[PDB]
Design an enzyme around this catalytic site. Structure first.
Site, short mmCIF file in Angstrom:
data_model
loop_
_atom_site.label_atom_id
_atom_site.label_comp_id
_atom_site.label_asym_id
_atom_site.label_seq_id
_atom_site.Cartn_x
_atom_site.Cartn_y
_atom_site.Cartn_z
CG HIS A 73 -0.61 0.30 2.59
ND1 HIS A 73 0.00 -0.77 3.26
CD2 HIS A 73 -0.76 1.33 3.33
CE1 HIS A 73 -0.05 -0.31 4.54
NE2 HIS A 73 -0.20 0.91 4.41
CG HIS A 75 0.01 4.23 4.64
ND1 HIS A 75 -0.70 3.82 5.45
CD2 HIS A 75 -0.55 5.54 4.11
CE1 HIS A 75 -1.93 4.58 5.54
NE2 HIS A 75 -1.65 5.41 4.66
CG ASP A 77 4.20 0.45 6.89
OD1 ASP A 77 3.55 0.62 5.93
OD2 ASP A 77 3.50 0.11 8.09
CG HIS A 136 -3.81 -0.07 6.66
ND1 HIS A 136 -3.90 0.52 8.20
CD2 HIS A 136 -2.74 0.38 6.31
CE1 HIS A 136 -2.81 1.45 8.09
NE2 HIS A 136 -2.06 1.04 7.03
CG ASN A 167 -3.82 6.97 11.09
OD1 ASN A 167 -4.82 7.00 10.62
ND2 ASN A 167 -2.83 7.92 11.18
#
Ligand SMILES: [Zn+2]
Ligand SMILES: [Zn+2]
Length: 214
Positions: A73, A75, A77, A136, A167
Site C-alpha cells: 500500500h 504508506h 512502512d 487499512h 491509524n
C-alpha cells in the site's frame, strides 16, 4: 537488531525493520523471496535509509540481487524506500490505485501493474497478489505464495498481540471486515500469515483481525 531477517523456509524469509518513531522502535514486516532469478521483496521499509540497509543485508546474506519489490500500500512502512528502488532499477510492483496514491502521498511512482488478482513468477517462485478490498487503506493488497501457503497480510492484518487497528483516518473500517473475509475465503489452508507488524502467525491472525473489527 534494527534490521532482521527470519526464515520461514529455504527460500522465504521475513524481513523486519525497526523504524524509529518518537524514540520508539516500531517493527514492520515484509518478505524476502530467494529465487533462482534474484531476491524479490514483499514491501520495502519505512524510508530510504532503512530500505538501503535492508537491500544491503539481503543481498549480502543470499549473494543475490534484489530485483523486484511488491508494494502492498501507498504508506511509509511499505513504499518509504521507493526512491531507493527506482535508483537501483528494482522494479516496484503495485496496483494502479497504489501508484495513484503514491503519486499523491509525496512518493515516486510504482508500476501499477497488479490487478485484483495477479500471478507473478520469479524463477520457480510463484507469487499471487490480491486486492481483497478496502481496509487499512483503500488500496491495500495481500500477497500469497501458493507453493507454500504463505500469506503476507501487510497492514490489513494484525498480529495476535495487537489490540488496536492503528491509524484509521484513511481506513475503511467497516469494509475492512469484508476485505479480511475475502482473504479468509480465498486462502483456505494457510501455513503462515505475516502481519504488517508483529509476530508471524497463521490463519488465526486473520480471525483475530476480524475480531478486532467486530
Ligand atoms: Zn498504512
Ligand atoms: Zn503499518
Amino acid at each position: 537488531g534494527t534490521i532482521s531477517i527470519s526464515q520461514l523456509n529455504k527460500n522465504v524469509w521475513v524481513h523486519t525493520e525497526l523504524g524509529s518513531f518518537n524514540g520508539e522502535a516500531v517493527p514492520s514486516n515484509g518478505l524476502v523471496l530467494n529465487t533462482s532469478k534474484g531476491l524479490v521483496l514483499v514491501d520495502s521499509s519505512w524510508d530510504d535509509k532503512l530500505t538501503k540497509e535492508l537491500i544491503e543485508m539481503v543481498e549480502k546474506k543470499f549473494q543475490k540481487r534484489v530485483t523486484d519489490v511488491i508494494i502492498t500500500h501507498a504508506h511509509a512502512d511499505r513504499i518509504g524506500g521507493i526512491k531507493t528502488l527506482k535508483e537501483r532499477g528494482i522494479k516496484a510492483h503495485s496496483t494502479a490505485l497504489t501508484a495513484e496514491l503514491a503519486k499523491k502521498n509525496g512518493y515516486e511512482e510504482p508500476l501499477g501493474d497488479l490487478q485484483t488478482v495477479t500471478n507473478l513468477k520469479f524463477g520457480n517462485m510463484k507469487v499471487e497478489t490480491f486486492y481483497p478490498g478496502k481496509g487499512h487503506t483503500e488500496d491495500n493488497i495481500v500477497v500469497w505464495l501458493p507453493q507454500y501457503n504463505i500469506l503476507v497480510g501487510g497492514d490489513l492484518v494484525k498480529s495476535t498481540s495487537a489490540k488496536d487497528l492503528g491509524n484509521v483516518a484513511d481506513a475503511y473500517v467497516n469494509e475492512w471486515s469484508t476485505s479480511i473475509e475475502n482473504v479468509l475465503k480465498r486462502y483456505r489452508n494457510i501455513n503462515a500469515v505475516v502481519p504488517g507488524h508483529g509476530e508471524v502467525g497463521d490463519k488465526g491472525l486473520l480471525l483475530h483481525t476480524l475480531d478486532l473489527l467486530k
